[PDB]
Protein backbone atom coordinates (compact mmCIF):
# COMPACT_ATOMS: atom_id res chain seq x y z
CA UNK A 1 0.00 0.00 0.00
CA UNK A 2 2.85 2.45 0.76
CA UNK A 3 6.27 0.76 0.20
CA UNK A 4 7.49 -2.73 -0.85
CA UNK A 5 10.80 -4.49 -1.57
CA UNK A 6 10.53 -6.86 -4.47
CA UNK A 7 13.57 -8.28 -6.28
CA UNK A 8 15.00 -9.93 -9.35
CA UNK A 9 18.50 -11.22 -10.12
CA UNK A 10 20.59 -11.61 -13.26
CA UNK A 11 23.79 -13.29 -14.43
CA UNK A 12 23.45 -15.88 -11.70
CA UNK A 13 24.12 -19.54 -11.94
CA UNK A 14 21.20 -21.68 -10.80
CA UNK A 15 23.50 -22.82 -8.06
CA UNK A 16 24.14 -19.24 -6.75
CA UNK A 17 20.55 -18.15 -7.05
CA UNK A 18 19.52 -20.71 -4.40
CA UNK A 19 21.46 -18.91 -1.71
CA UNK A 20 19.73 -15.82 -2.82
CA UNK A 21 16.35 -17.43 -2.55
CA UNK A 22 17.37 -18.65 0.84
CA UNK A 23 18.16 -15.13 2.03
CA UNK A 24 15.06 -13.68 0.52
CA UNK A 25 12.99 -16.31 2.13
CA UNK A 26 14.74 -15.54 5.41
CA UNK A 27 14.10 -11.84 5.54
CA UNK A 28 10.43 -11.66 4.59
CA UNK A 29 11.62 -10.55 1.12
CA UNK A 30 9.60 -10.66 -2.05
CA UNK A 31 11.33 -12.04 -5.07
CA UNK A 32 10.18 -12.40 -8.64
CA UNK A 33 12.02 -13.75 -11.66
CA UNK A 34 10.22 -11.50 -14.12
CA UNK A 35 10.70 -7.74 -13.60
CA UNK A 36 8.36 -4.69 -13.20
CA UNK A 37 7.82 -1.30 -11.61
CA UNK A 38 7.02 -3.32 -8.55
CA UNK A 39 10.69 -4.40 -8.58
CA UNK A 40 12.83 -2.22 -6.41
CA UNK A 41 16.13 -3.98 -5.95
CA UNK A 42 18.06 -5.72 -8.72
CA UNK A 43 20.92 -8.00 -7.88
CA UNK A 44 23.75 -8.54 -10.29
CA UNK A 45 26.78 -10.78 -10.28
CA UNK A 46 29.91 -8.67 -10.20
CA UNK A 47 33.63 -8.60 -9.85
CA UNK A 48 35.27 -7.40 -6.61
CA UNK A 49 34.99 -3.77 -7.80
CA UNK A 50 31.24 -4.18 -8.44
CA UNK A 51 31.51 -4.41 -12.21
CA UNK A 52 29.12 -6.65 -14.12
CA UNK A 53 28.15 -7.92 -17.55
CA UNK A 54 25.19 -6.40 -19.36
CA UNK A 55 22.09 -8.49 -19.20
CA UNK A 56 18.69 -7.31 -20.17
CA UNK A 57 17.68 -6.88 -16.56
CA UNK A 58 20.80 -4.85 -16.03
CA UNK A 59 19.61 -2.29 -18.57
CA UNK A 60 15.98 -2.19 -17.39
CA UNK A 61 16.66 -1.62 -13.70
CA UNK A 62 18.80 1.35 -14.48
CA UNK A 63 16.16 2.80 -16.83
CA UNK A 64 13.58 2.25 -14.10
CA UNK A 65 15.98 3.97 -11.75
CA UNK A 66 16.10 1.03 -9.46
CA UNK A 67 18.57 -0.01 -6.83
CA UNK A 68 21.16 -1.98 -8.73
CA UNK A 69 23.50 -3.94 -6.45
CA UNK A 70 26.09 -6.69 -6.37
CA UNK A 71 25.63 -10.29 -5.40
CA UNK A 72 28.46 -9.73 -2.99
CA UNK A 73 25.94 -7.77 -0.98
CA UNK A 74 24.28 -11.09 -0.32
CA UNK A 75 27.34 -13.20 0.22
CA UNK A 76 28.39 -10.63 2.82
CA UNK A 77 24.85 -10.31 4.23
CA UNK A 78 25.08 -14.12 4.53
CA UNK A 79 28.50 -13.98 6.07
CA UNK A 80 27.12 -11.70 8.82
CA UNK A 81 23.75 -13.48 8.48
CA UNK A 82 22.46 -9.96 8.83
CA UNK A 83 20.73 -7.39 6.61
CA UNK A 84 23.74 -5.39 5.41
CA UNK A 85 23.26 -2.00 3.81
CA UNK A 86 22.61 -2.22 0.03
CA UNK A 87 23.95 1.15 -0.79
CA UNK A 88 27.52 0.24 -0.31
CA UNK A 89 27.22 -2.72 -2.68
CA UNK A 90 25.76 -0.62 -5.45
CA UNK A 91 27.17 -1.21 -8.92
CA UNK A 92 29.75 1.29 -10.11
CA UNK A 93 29.98 0.16 -13.75
CA UNK A 94 30.14 -2.59 -16.34
CA UNK A 95 32.50 -4.29 -18.78
CA UNK A 96 31.72 -2.34 -21.94
CA UNK A 97 31.13 1.17 -20.63
CA UNK A 98 33.78 1.55 -17.96
CA UNK A 99 34.22 -0.13 -14.65
CA UNK A 100 33.05 2.96 -12.72
CA UNK A 101 30.81 5.04 -14.92
CA UNK A 102 28.35 5.37 -11.99
CA UNK A 103 25.40 5.07 -14.40
CA UNK A 104 22.84 3.28 -12.15
CA UNK A 105 23.72 5.77 -9.42
CA UNK A 106 23.04 8.58 -11.91
CA UNK A 107 19.82 7.04 -13.04
CA UNK A 108 18.56 7.06 -9.47
CA UNK A 109 19.13 10.77 -9.11
CA UNK A 110 18.41 12.08 -12.62
CA UNK A 111 14.72 11.25 -12.67
CA UNK A 112 13.41 14.74 -13.18
CA UNK A 113 15.56 14.80 -16.40
CA UNK A 114 14.89 11.58 -18.27
CA UNK A 115 17.41 11.15 -20.98
CA UNK A 116 15.20 10.50 -23.97
CA UNK A 117 12.57 13.02 -23.04
CA UNK A 118 10.91 14.63 -26.05
CA UNK A 119 11.92 11.87 -28.43
CA UNK A 120 9.69 9.73 -30.64
CA UNK A 121 11.16 6.28 -31.35
CA UNK A 122 10.18 3.47 -33.63
CA UNK A 123 12.01 0.40 -32.45
CA UNK A 124 12.13 -0.94 -35.93
CA UNK A 125 12.29 -4.77 -36.32
CA UNK A 126 14.01 -7.09 -36.14
CA UNK A 127 16.03 -7.92 -33.04
CA UNK A 128 17.38 -10.70 -30.84
CA UNK A 129 17.76 -11.53 -27.14
CA UNK A 130 15.38 -8.85 -26.27
CA UNK A 131 12.07 -8.44 -28.02
CA UNK A 132 11.10 -5.11 -29.30
CA UNK A 133 8.33 -4.62 -26.74
CA UNK A 134 10.96 -4.73 -24.01
CA UNK A 135 13.25 -2.38 -25.79
CA UNK A 136 10.25 -0.19 -26.29
CA UNK A 137 9.52 -0.37 -22.53
CA UNK A 138 13.08 0.50 -21.76
CA UNK A 139 12.96 3.80 -23.54
CA UNK A 140 9.52 4.76 -22.23
CA UNK A 141 11.28 4.51 -18.88
CA UNK A 142 13.83 6.93 -20.16
CA UNK A 143 11.28 9.53 -21.20
CA UNK A 144 10.88 8.47 -24.78
CA UNK A 145 7.71 8.67 -26.74
CA UNK A 146 7.36 5.38 -28.72
CA UNK A 147 6.20 4.73 -32.25
CA UNK A 148 4.94 1.57 -33.83
CA UNK A 149 5.34 2.27 -37.49
CA UNK A 150 7.47 4.55 -39.53
CA UNK A 151 4.62 6.49 -41.07
CA UNK A 152 3.24 7.15 -37.60
CA UNK A 153 6.09 9.54 -36.78
CA UNK A 154 4.45 12.68 -35.47
CA UNK A 155 5.96 15.39 -37.55
CA UNK A 156 6.95 18.85 -36.55
CA UNK A 157 8.79 20.38 -35.00
CA UNK A 158 9.50 20.16 -31.26
CA UNK A 159 9.36 16.38 -31.48
CA UNK A 160 12.42 14.37 -32.50
CA UNK A 161 12.10 11.17 -34.55
CA UNK A 162 14.67 8.34 -34.31
CA UNK A 163 14.91 4.83 -35.68
CA UNK A 164 16.65 1.90 -34.03
CA UNK A 165 17.57 -1.52 -35.37
CA UNK A 166 19.82 -4.49 -34.67
CA UNK A 167 21.30 -4.96 -38.10
CA UNK A 168 23.11 -8.30 -37.78
CA UNK A 169 19.62 -9.56 -36.84
CA UNK A 170 18.72 -9.13 -40.50
CA UNK A 171 18.65 -12.49 -42.25
CA UNK A 172 19.86 -12.38 -45.83
CA UNK A 173 18.77 -8.71 -46.18
CA UNK A 174 21.04 -5.65 -46.18
CA UNK A 175 17.85 -3.70 -46.28
CA UNK A 176 18.56 -1.40 -43.32
CA UNK A 177 20.27 1.06 -45.70
CA UNK A 178 17.06 1.82 -47.54
CA UNK A 179 15.20 3.10 -44.50
CA UNK A 180 16.56 6.56 -45.34
CA UNK A 181 13.96 6.39 -48.11
CA UNK A 182 11.08 5.25 -45.88
CA UNK A 183 11.40 8.43 -43.88
CA UNK A 184 13.88 11.19 -43.32
CA UNK A 185 14.60 10.58 -39.71
CA UNK A 186 17.83 9.33 -38.22
CA UNK A 187 18.78 5.64 -38.30
CA UNK A 188 20.93 4.41 -35.49
CA UNK A 189 21.90 1.10 -33.91
CA UNK A 190 20.61 -0.38 -30.74
CA UNK A 191 24.08 0.17 -29.31
CA UNK A 192 23.22 3.83 -28.98
CA UNK A 193 20.30 3.14 -26.70
CA UNK A 194 22.06 0.57 -24.62
CA UNK A 195 25.11 2.77 -24.08
CA UNK A 196 22.94 5.83 -23.57
CA UNK A 197 21.17 3.86 -20.93
CA UNK A 198 24.27 2.18 -19.51
CA UNK A 199 25.63 5.62 -18.55
CA UNK A 200 22.20 7.14 -18.12
CA UNK A 201 22.91 9.98 -20.55
CA UNK A 202 21.68 10.44 -24.05
CA UNK A 203 24.57 9.86 -26.43
CA UNK A 204 25.85 11.28 -29.64
CA UNK A 205 23.97 9.80 -32.53
CA UNK A 206 27.09 10.03 -34.69
CA UNK A 207 29.02 7.02 -33.63
CA UNK A 208 25.84 4.95 -33.82
CA UNK A 209 24.44 6.28 -37.04
CA UNK A 210 23.91 3.95 -39.89
CA UNK A 211 24.78 4.54 -43.55
CA UNK A 212 21.85 4.96 -45.84
CA UNK A 213 21.02 4.63 -49.46
CA UNK A 214 18.67 6.82 -51.65
Amino acid sequence: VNKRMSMVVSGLTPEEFMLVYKFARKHHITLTNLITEETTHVVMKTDAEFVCERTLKYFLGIAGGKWVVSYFWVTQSIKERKMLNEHDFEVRGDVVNGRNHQGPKRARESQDRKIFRGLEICCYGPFTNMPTDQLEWMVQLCGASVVKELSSFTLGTGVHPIVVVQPDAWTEDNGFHAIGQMCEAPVVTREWVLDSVALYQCQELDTYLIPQIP
Binding site: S10, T55, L56
Partner: peptide, 9 residues
Protein backbone atom coordinates in the same frame (compact mmCIF):
# COMPACT_ATOMS: atom_id res chain seq x y z
CA UNK B 1 17.42 -29.20 -21.37
CA UNK B 2 18.95 -28.67 -17.91
CA UNK B 3 20.48 -25.68 -19.54
CA UNK B 4 20.86 -22.57 -19.93
CA UNK B 5 22.27 -18.89 -19.28
CA UNK B 6 21.27 -15.21 -19.25
CA UNK B 7 22.10 -13.39 -22.52
CA UNK B 8 24.77 -10.68 -22.35
CA UNK B 9 25.44 -7.67 -24.63
Amino acid sequence: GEYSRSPTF
